[PDB]
Amino acid sequence: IVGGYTCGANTVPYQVSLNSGYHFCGGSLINSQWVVSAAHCYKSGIQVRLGEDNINVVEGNEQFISASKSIVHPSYNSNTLNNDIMLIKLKSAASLNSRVASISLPTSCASAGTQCLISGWGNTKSSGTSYPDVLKCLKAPILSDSSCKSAYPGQITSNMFCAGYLEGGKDSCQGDSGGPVVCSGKLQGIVSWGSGCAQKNKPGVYTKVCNYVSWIKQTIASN
């Protein structure tokens, strides 16, 4: 997250870190045994780390649980990034508490201008790299479809939206992929892609979770 703030320990209790001997992507806990992340974050060897603040220190409140299922959307397109969503089933259920909590799925899509909370352990610099120990947060609005498409012509599918800013300085960045965009208490987005981070006229692009609620429910029910 570039241009954000330190969230504070466990203030985003649905935020998970996906770990393979290092943090590589975020995710969002949606029930005690399932996490939403991005399709492009799929790999072998995923350990889900719940309850984290400082990802480099065992502070208390962590739960480390292996993925037992990693389910990339069957129609994920790795060149266009359409359908950039993955479900992870945890090998055992997480112990839910005030520091480890699920986030609700949308009942409808969000409107432009709604303020959302974007969070993660990604790079905090728009030029160069700095990876934070503790979770970072950014308040950011949903952009209109027409402005999103103006910024990224021919690339924004019906399963994407833009959020953030156009003046530069505030965005998600590398290492934030897969993590949450939460707007009035609903998981509306998954950090996906952009042209750089925090660049003028190049807002972040996010998977539109409201299009996948039925797919998520059907997939969880069958697994």
Partner: peptide
């Protein structure tokens, strides 16, 4: 340029 926000990024020309 156009890149995913993973470690490492996946980028497109």
């Amino acid at each position: 340029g156009r890149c995913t926000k993973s470690i490492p990024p996946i980028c497109f020309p």
